[PDB]
Amino acid sequence: GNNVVVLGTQWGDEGKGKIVDLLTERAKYVVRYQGGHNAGHTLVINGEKTVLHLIPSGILRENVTSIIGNGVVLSPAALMKEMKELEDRGIPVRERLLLSEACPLILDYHVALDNAREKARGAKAIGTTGRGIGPAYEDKVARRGLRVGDLFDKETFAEKLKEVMEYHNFQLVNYYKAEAVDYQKVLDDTMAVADILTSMVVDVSDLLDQARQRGDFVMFEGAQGTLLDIDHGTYPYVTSSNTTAGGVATGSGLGPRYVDYVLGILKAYSTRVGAGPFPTELFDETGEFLCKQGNEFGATTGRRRRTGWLDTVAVRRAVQLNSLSGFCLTKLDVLDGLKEVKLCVAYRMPDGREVTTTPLAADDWKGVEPIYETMPGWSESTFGVKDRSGLPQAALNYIKRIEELTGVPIDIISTGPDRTETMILRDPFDA
Amino acid sequence: GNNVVVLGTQWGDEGKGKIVDLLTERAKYVVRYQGGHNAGHTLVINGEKTVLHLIPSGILRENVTSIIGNGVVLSPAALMKEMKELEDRGIPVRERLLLSEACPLILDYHVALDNAREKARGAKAIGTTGRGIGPAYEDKVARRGLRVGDLFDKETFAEKLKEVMEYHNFQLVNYYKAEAVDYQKVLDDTMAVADILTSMVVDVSDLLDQARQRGDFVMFEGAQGTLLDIDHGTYPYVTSSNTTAGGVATGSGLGPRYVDYVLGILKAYSTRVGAGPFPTELFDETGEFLCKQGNEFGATTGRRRRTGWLDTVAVRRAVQLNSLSGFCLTKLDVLDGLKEVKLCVAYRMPDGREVTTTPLAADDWKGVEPIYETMPGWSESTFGVKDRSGLPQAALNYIKRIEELTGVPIDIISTGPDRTETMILRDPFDA
Ligand SMILES: Nc1nc2c(ncn2[C@@H]2O[C@H](COP(=O)(O)OP(=O)(O)O)[C@@H](O)[C@H]2O)c(=O)[nH]1
Ligand SMILES: Nc1nc2c(ncn2[C@@H]2O[C@H](COP(=O)(O)OP(=O)(O)O)[C@@H](O)[C@H]2O)c(=O)[nH]1
Ligand SMILES: O=P(O)(O)OC[C@H]1O[C@@H](n2cnc3c(OP(=O)(O)O)ncnc32)C[C@@H]1O
Ligand SMILES: O=P(O)(O)OC[C@H]1O[C@@H](n2cnc3c(OP(=O)(O)O)ncnc32)C[C@@H]1O
Ligand SMILES: O=CN(O)CC(=O)O
Ligand SMILES: O=CN(O)CC(=O)O
Ligand SMILES: [Mg+2]
Ligand SMILES: [Mg+2]
């Protein structure tokens, strides 16, 4: 179909950035619909690396108009920092990026709050990226938050900013005993980039509606992953937005009935950065192997990622929540050399029951044990293979099993960080 | 289709409760996906009235399983209050109601906070229903909020409740100078109903997925209305949840691609309860007429509702945001006796431009003027008419014009508060 959603079926870092950059060759628009700069999407073109955070992954293509939708919490600072970094590399961001006036603004005090809250949790810290994401979504739903639209009146903005900061600082100092955030500083930093930021404003809801009516190709790019979903993830160890497919509509304004295909980015194994339940987590040599071979370190915080086997129980939950149309199996090449590979096919509950369904809130995942199916690995190299024909049978079997267990086909297979180290068996845009 | 969404295309109170109760005769499930008890849905069967708030509008049908989805903020108090009221009237709520463990809990301190925040806004008060809705969504996205799932461990719950209340009370007394909320009282009130509440818990995401695979008829019932949407409504004069169609997926767990038909409940004229922009608002005799004839008073707060002409510009925004399949025109009977009727077809911006599109944030609606198309009214009574044949031509013309202006057909016409005072031209379930 014309409207394709690319999102993470696990705990993020599945390879959304690459696949979005890969598939947008035919797209007219690329749209981020939730999250903020907590995301870290890595693109590699002819060996050249690019890490995006707030800026959509279609920014490297000039035929594409990248769009930061209303569902996104936007940090003017982060935007300018990335804009300048990309512009110095020949990417004219301002010319291909548009954003929603309904976007909530992330400012310094949000970060201070983020840090304070994480501190107060002590050993039970969520392990946020400390980018102020949570607090920004909080001011939004509370209805005191600032939005891009507020910037259109420099005067009234300063007033609104002043009272909201008086509100937060009171808490930062009196309740948390932390430094206060300077009103004037935040006002100046923001005012220094107001004209640039506002010149990219557009009515995204309307734009996407017109694009749909014209049959334009639109790609929605998700951030984080399904199990980090504020509603359906391992609460409270989740992000504060809806990472699941439903967030596409709320975060862009496109009517939900206009989603044609949902592509789940599925990593051949599992990773998680931040605290929280991880049934198939490995602490042995294999885990260490995955981390090393997969270069698993947060593209945003650089923190070492927790590793584990692919979890079919957890992935099946992602199938139903996102009404997945197909998967894109990534980093299959990272498993090369393993004597055997395992995939969780069931959970052994603390009371002894065997289930094929996942617990909701984090607490409920306690004591849950993974039940594995063990398959033969392969010594052959699959790195960069662009044809299923060039893959070992053990790998094909592993692929087929995943499909059988999930009931969803694997339409794309990635064998390397580069845009071309991939094999598209079925393109979402014409499927 | 099998999955039909019924939601408000305006500012709420369009008549969602009636139409849901009307159409669920063929439904297996009815699902609320956002909001809380701030909603007020009025059902009238053979003259008998029922006002629901938290409880879905399919509760009066025994063949229907009502479901409070995860997107809903749930007040244990409100639930029990409604449960007992309905049970004393022969409606065995506990036997036909199921709810999500992922639902955030609304407790007394949320109400206190709600009241405090509204006080702090002074003359710029949002005009919330003071039910604690906003604060509950705030604790949720912040990830400190309590959920139905937490109730499964009475011990750990008290601990979690204790620390979150210490957090909020600090603010209530030190920052707002308001009374504190008693921890023990909240703990006892909640514990007094824990067993009842938890006995209705079910995995809603999974349930709806199985129901979809079986082809069961599912009706999603929205609360509030499109322009009250936290993202797309007249911010900050909106509710704190996504009232638009996209909220169906995030608030229930059903994959977005599984929405078959979206039915927009459209009142023949406009009403708004709470502060905020209202372009076609009438302060004359006609406005007073609408209020009186339409018995316009919040079914939840009893507050007099602001009235005005039907706004096609604002409604068109609802068309695209919700990817509407059709409308259900309600309270056509309330216009009987008017010499002429008007419908806004364009906006005159403050700078002089004529536009057919709506402003986003409230501030941006300032100075906006409505441009009307005036049509002849009708003296004939349309109350209770169950056949389009029994409607005056002027009414048919008014109906056709609405369709022409919006590009969406009016599949149902309501002519009275009773379930039967209606005419279904096309049923969403088989259309
Ligand atoms: N070996 C290998 N690396 C890949 C593949 N696809 C992506 N990567 C790399 O894996 C990492 C994924 O992290 P990240 O970019 O945070 O994923 P995202 O957050 O989903 O965009 C990046 O460093 C990519 O360059 C693949 O198929 N094979
Ligand atoms: N005259 C008339 N009243 C109606 C009709 N449909 C519903 N009502 C009444 O209009 C009111 C609508 O308010 P409310 O129930 O809050 O609407 P909701 O919040 O969308 O469910 C109720 O008192 C209904 O009984 C209709 O077609 N005609
Ligand atoms: O900062 P936060 O409040 O969102 O942290 C809350 C939890 O969310 C985790 N986190 C946040 N963003 C991403 C991420 O984004 P990507 O690159 O788009 O896939 N990939 C992986 N993990 C992520 C870290 C915390 O446990
Ligand atoms: O209490 P709140 O925070 O949601 O108030 C924020 C604003 O939302 C308005 N409000 C809330 N719920 C409803 C409503 O629900 P219904 O019966 O389902 O249609 N119908 C009409 N207006 C409503 C009142 C405030 O301006
Ligand atoms: O690329 C995003 N993450 O992995 C998050 C982080 O770096 O913490
Ligand atoms: O029926 C719901 N509303 O009208 C809200 C209120 O009563 O304030
Ligand atoms: Mg990443
Ligand atoms: Mg109502």
mmCIF file of N, CA, C and O in Angstrom, chain B residues 200-233:
data_model
loop_
_atom_site.group_PDB
_atom_site.id
_atom_site.type_symbol
_atom_site.label_atom_id
_atom_site.label_comp_id
_atom_site.label_asym_id
_atom_site.label_seq_id
_atom_site.Cartn_x
_atom_site.Cartn_y
_atom_site.Cartn_z
ATOM 1 N N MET B 200 -13.003 -8.799 37.438
ATOM 2 C CA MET B 200 -13.466 -8.471 36.097
ATOM 3 C C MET B 200 -12.298 -8.258 35.135
ATOM 4 O O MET B 200 -12.499 -7.924 33.964
ATOM 5 N N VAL B 201 -11.079 -8.455 35.632
ATOM 6 C CA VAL B 201 -9.889 -8.273 34.803
ATOM 7 C C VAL B 201 -9.752 -9.324 33.710
ATOM 8 O O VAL B 201 -10.002 -10.506 33.935
ATOM 9 N N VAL B 202 -9.341 -8.878 32.526
ATOM 10 C CA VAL B 202 -9.132 -9.774 31.398
ATOM 11 C C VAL B 202 -8.046 -9.167 30.511
ATOM 12 O O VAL B 202 -7.773 -7.968 30.594
ATOM 13 N N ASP B 203 -7.412 -9.993 29.687
ATOM 14 C CA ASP B 203 -6.379 -9.507 28.767
ATOM 15 C C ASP B 203 -7.158 -9.003 27.556
ATOM 16 O O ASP B 203 -7.446 -9.760 26.628
ATOM 17 N N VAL B 204 -7.503 -7.721 27.575
ATOM 18 C CA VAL B 204 -8.292 -7.116 26.505
ATOM 19 C C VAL B 204 -7.657 -7.185 25.116
ATOM 20 O O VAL B 204 -8.354 -7.498 24.133
ATOM 21 N N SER B 205 -6.354 -6.915 25.027
ATOM 22 C CA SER B 205 -5.659 -6.976 23.736
ATOM 23 C C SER B 205 -5.868 -8.348 23.117
ATOM 24 O O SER B 205 -6.244 -8.474 21.944
ATOM 25 N N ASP B 206 -5.613 -9.376 23.916
ATOM 26 C CA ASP B 206 -5.759 -10.744 23.457
ATOM 27 C C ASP B 206 -7.212 -11.067 23.134
ATOM 28 O O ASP B 206 -7.511 -11.650 22.097
ATOM 29 N N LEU B 207 -8.120 -10.686 24.023
ATOM 30 C CA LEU B 207 -9.542 -10.936 23.809
ATOM 31 C C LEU B 207 -10.029 -10.358 22.469
ATOM 32 O O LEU B 207 -10.712 -11.032 21.693
ATOM 33 N N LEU B 208 -9.686 -9.105 22.198
ATOM 34 C CA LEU B 208 -10.114 -8.473 20.958
ATOM 35 C C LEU B 208 -9.443 -9.114 19.738
ATOM 36 O O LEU B 208 -10.020 -9.156 18.651
ATOM 37 N N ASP B 209 -8.223 -9.611 19.911
ATOM 38 C CA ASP B 209 -7.529 -10.254 18.802
ATOM 39 C C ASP B 209 -8.242 -11.557 18.443
ATOM 40 O O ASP B 209 -8.416 -11.877 17.267
ATOM 41 N N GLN B 210 -8.654 -12.304 19.461
ATOM 42 C CA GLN B 210 -9.358 -13.563 19.239
ATOM 43 C C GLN B 210 -10.731 -13.272 18.637
ATOM 44 O O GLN B 210 -11.192 -13.980 17.745
ATOM 45 N N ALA B 211 -11.373 -12.212 19.120
ATOM 46 C CA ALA B 211 -12.685 -11.814 18.621
ATOM 47 C C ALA B 211 -12.609 -11.414 17.150
ATOM 48 O O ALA B 211 -13.530 -11.689 16.378
ATOM 49 N N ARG B 212 -11.517 -10.757 16.765
ATOM 50 C CA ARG B 212 -11.344 -10.336 15.381
ATOM 51 C C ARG B 212 -11.197 -11.548 14.481
ATOM 52 O O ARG B 212 -11.778 -11.608 13.397
ATOM 53 N N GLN B 213 -10.397 -12.505 14.935
ATOM 54 C CA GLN B 213 -10.156 -13.713 14.171
ATOM 55 C C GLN B 213 -11.426 -14.538 14.006
ATOM 56 O O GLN B 213 -11.553 -15.283 13.042
ATOM 57 N N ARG B 214 -12.365 -14.396 14.937
ATOM 58 C CA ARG B 214 -13.630 -15.120 14.865
ATOM 59 C C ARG B 214 -14.671 -14.314 14.094
ATOM 60 O O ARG B 214 -15.778 -14.791 13.849
ATOM 61 N N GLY B 215 -14.328 -13.088 13.721
ATOM 62 C CA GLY B 215 -15.281 -12.269 13.001
ATOM 63 C C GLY B 215 -16.407 -11.746 13.881
ATOM 64 O O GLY B 215 -17.488 -11.440 13.379
ATOM 65 N N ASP B 216 -16.177 -11.648 15.190
ATOM 66 C CA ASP B 216 -17.210 -11.126 16.082
ATOM 67 C C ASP B 216 -17.421 -9.634 15.833
ATOM 68 O O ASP B 216 -16.510 -8.931 15.400
ATOM 69 N N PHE B 217 -18.629 -9.161 16.116
ATOM 70 C CA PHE B 217 -18.970 -7.755 15.962
ATOM 71 C C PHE B 217 -18.486 -7.005 17.200
ATOM 72 O O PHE B 217 -18.877 -7.327 18.320
ATOM 73 N N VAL B 218 -17.634 -6.006 16.990
ATOM 74 C CA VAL B 218 -17.093 -5.218 18.088
ATOM 75 C C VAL B 218 -17.369 -3.733 17.885
ATOM 76 O O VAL B 218 -17.117 -3.182 16.815
ATOM 77 N N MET B 219 -17.902 -3.083 18.911
ATOM 78 C CA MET B 219 -18.168 -1.653 18.820
ATOM 79 C C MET B 219 -17.304 -0.897 19.817
ATOM 80 O O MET B 219 -17.305 -1.197 21.010
ATOM 81 N N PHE B 220 -16.546 0.072 19.324
ATOM 82 C CA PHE B 220 -15.703 0.885 20.191
ATOM 83 C C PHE B 220 -16.448 2.178 20.447
ATOM 84 O O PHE B 220 -16.880 2.852 19.513
ATOM 85 N N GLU B 221 -16.614 2.512 21.718
ATOM 86 C CA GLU B 221 -17.334 3.718 22.104
ATOM 87 C C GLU B 221 -16.398 4.816 22.583
ATOM 88 O O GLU B 221 -15.677 4.643 23.564
ATOM 89 N N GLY B 222 -16.411 5.952 21.897
ATOM 90 C CA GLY B 222 -15.543 7.039 22.305
ATOM 91 C C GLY B 222 -16.202 7.915 23.351
ATOM 92 O O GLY B 222 -17.404 7.811 23.582
ATOM 93 N N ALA B 223 -15.407 8.761 23.999
ATOM 94 C CA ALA B 223 -15.899 9.695 25.009
ATOM 95 C C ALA B 223 -15.474 11.082 24.525
ATOM 96 O O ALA B 223 -14.610 11.199 23.657
ATOM 97 N N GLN B 224 -16.064 12.128 25.086
ATOM 98 C CA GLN B 224 -15.749 13.487 24.665
ATOM 99 C C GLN B 224 -15.912 13.628 23.147
ATOM 100 O O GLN B 224 -16.763 12.968 22.556
ATOM 101 N N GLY B 225 -15.099 14.483 22.528
ATOM 102 C CA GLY B 225 -15.200 14.696 21.092
ATOM 103 C C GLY B 225 -13.891 15.080 20.416
ATOM 104 O O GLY B 225 -12.909 15.412 21.078
ATOM 105 N N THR B 226 -13.884 15.051 19.087
ATOM 106 C CA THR B 226 -12.680 15.355 18.328
ATOM 107 C C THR B 226 -11.943 16.647 18.723
ATOM 108 O O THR B 226 -10.741 16.612 18.973
ATOM 109 N N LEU B 227 -12.642 17.777 18.808
ATOM 110 C CA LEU B 227 -11.949 19.021 19.150
ATOM 111 C C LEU B 227 -11.477 19.142 20.604
ATOM 112 O O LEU B 227 -10.926 20.173 21.009
ATOM 113 N N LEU B 228 -11.691 18.079 21.377
ATOM 114 C CA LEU B 228 -11.242 18.025 22.762
ATOM 115 C C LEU B 228 -10.010 17.113 22.822
ATOM 116 O O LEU B 228 -9.446 16.876 23.895
ATOM 117 N N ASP B 229 -9.591 16.610 21.659
ATOM 118 C CA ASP B 229 -8.427 15.727 21.574
ATOM 119 C C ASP B 229 -7.160 16.418 22.098
ATOM 120 O O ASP B 229 -6.830 17.533 21.685
ATOM 121 N N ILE B 230 -6.453 15.743 23.000
ATOM 122 C CA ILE B 230 -5.253 16.299 23.613
ATOM 123 C C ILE B 230 -4.190 16.756 22.615
ATOM 124 O O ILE B 230 -3.444 17.698 22.877
ATOM 125 N N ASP B 231 -4.127 16.091 21.468
ATOM 126 C CA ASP B 231 -3.160 16.440 20.442
ATOM 127 C C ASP B 231 -3.731 17.393 19.398
ATOM 128 O O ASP B 231 -3.145 18.436 19.110
ATOM 129 N N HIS B 232 -4.883 17.028 18.841
ATOM 130 C CA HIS B 232 -5.493 17.794 17.761
ATOM 131 C C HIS B 232 -6.594 18.778 18.102
ATOM 132 O O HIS B 232 -7.061 19.496 17.224
ATOM 133 N N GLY B 233 -7.020 18.812 19.359
ATOM 134 C CA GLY B 233 -8.074 19.739 19.739
ATOM 135 C C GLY B 233 -7.580 21.145 20.044
ATOM 136 O O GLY B 233 -6.395 21.447 19.910
#
